């Protein structure tokens, strides 16, 4: 519970990189690190469905760097409370997504899988 750390990075599309403010459509990237390694990754996009990614199943798509090598703990305003991650995760259908990666046996065991399995 104390080794669990949560980060958020607002972003804009590289296509809107050099446009005026009113044309920069914002999304948000989220990561849940279980100790050094990302257990859950989540992306809110302005123009497509949310992307949900869990360790094991989605390893090739997710951030590959550990917490120390991301530098996120050194980026001011990046860190968020657990609740700020979970509220979004839940609204995006993250529980059904994680549960499905467990049952299909694609998910790597993490603090996140343990918490869901405790519920079920």
């Amino acid at each position: 519970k104390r080794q669990q750390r949560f980060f958020r990075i607002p972003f804009i599309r590289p296509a809107d990189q050099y446009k005026d403010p009113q044309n920069k459509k914002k999304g948000w990237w989220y990561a849940h690190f279980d100790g050094p390694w990302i257990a859950r990754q989540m992306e809110l996009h302005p123009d497509k469905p949310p992307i949900l990614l869990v360790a094991g199943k989605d390893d090739m798509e997710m951030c590959e760097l550990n917490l120390e090598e991301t530098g996120l703990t050194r980026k001011r305003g990046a860190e968020i409370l657990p609740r700020q991650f979970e509220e979004i995760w839940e609204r995006c259908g993250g529980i059904q997504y994680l549960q499905s990666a467990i049952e299909s046996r694609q998910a790597r065991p993490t603090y996140a899988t343990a918490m869901l399995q405790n519920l079920l």
């Binding site: 990075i9 607002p10 972003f11 999304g27 990237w29 992306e43 991301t70 996120l72 980026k75």
Partner: protein, 38 residues
């Protein structure tokens, strides 16, 4: 400070152009302490 070069490369190639998170309460409190602790 900031994220590593490996992360900046990852984020731009895979996600997008990172934007700043604004907390006025962090900022303004630190601005006040700049004045107080002078």
């Amino acid at each position: 400070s900031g994220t590593s070069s490996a992360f900046s490369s990852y984020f731009n190639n895979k996600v997008g152009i990172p934007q700043e998170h604004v907390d006025h309460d962090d900022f303004d409190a630190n601005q006040l302490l700049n004045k107080i602790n002078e």
